[PDB]
Design a protein around this ligand. Structure first.
Ligand code: MN3
Length: 171
């Protein structure tokens, strides 16, 4: 029944998630949960993290695991500005005065995909003028996906996880 299906998925994630230190904390955050709302929340966060790592790899960006704001990313390179909107990008790369910001997401339906694409696009665009005041050029990348498939977990395990997560919506 449902309990054994959850236990099975936990065992599969334990065995088959990539053995990668960057995933360890979120792997545990999922595995320790008992309540359906928390299995959903942490299971989705695990999948998002996996996709972000892949997206950053594919786009030549650093994954922003320290949750640096754009202001902090600039500060790390000795560039001070107090005037930026608060943005914590999924990934980034700052090389000289060229700032690449990467936003990543998964949405299945066209309406939801479009809503999130617009949201992330506008968020990055709103940095552009203020970045110019400190001589920074912005390359804003949006990796919007419809798929949860990723290099950090086998697709068959991904399917089992998502199916179980779907079933948990009943609670
Ligand atoms: Mn984002």
């Amino acid at each position: 029944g449902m309990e054994e299906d959850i236990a099975c998925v936990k065992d599969l994630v334990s065995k088959y998630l990539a053995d990668n230190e960057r995933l360890s904390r979120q792997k545990l955050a999922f595995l320790v949960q008992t309540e359906p709302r928390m299995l959903l929340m942490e299971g989705l966060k695990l999948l998002s993290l996996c996709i972000e790592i892949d997206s950053c790899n594919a786009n030549g960006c650093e994954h922003n695991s320290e949750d640096k704001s754009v202001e902090r990313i600039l500060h790390d390179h000795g560039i001070l500005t107090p005037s930026l909107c608060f943005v914590v990008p999924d990934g980034y790369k700052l090389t000289g005065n060229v700032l690449i910001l990467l936003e990543c997401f998964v949405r299945s339906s066209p309406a939801n995909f479009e809503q999130k694409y617009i949201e992330d696009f506008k968020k990055l665009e709103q940095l552009k003028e203020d970045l110019k005041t400190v001589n920074i050029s912005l390359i804003p990348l949006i990796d919007g996906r419809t798929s949860f498939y990723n290099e950090q977990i086998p697709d068959w395990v991904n399917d089992k996880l998502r199916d179980t997560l779907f079933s948990l919506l009943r609670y």
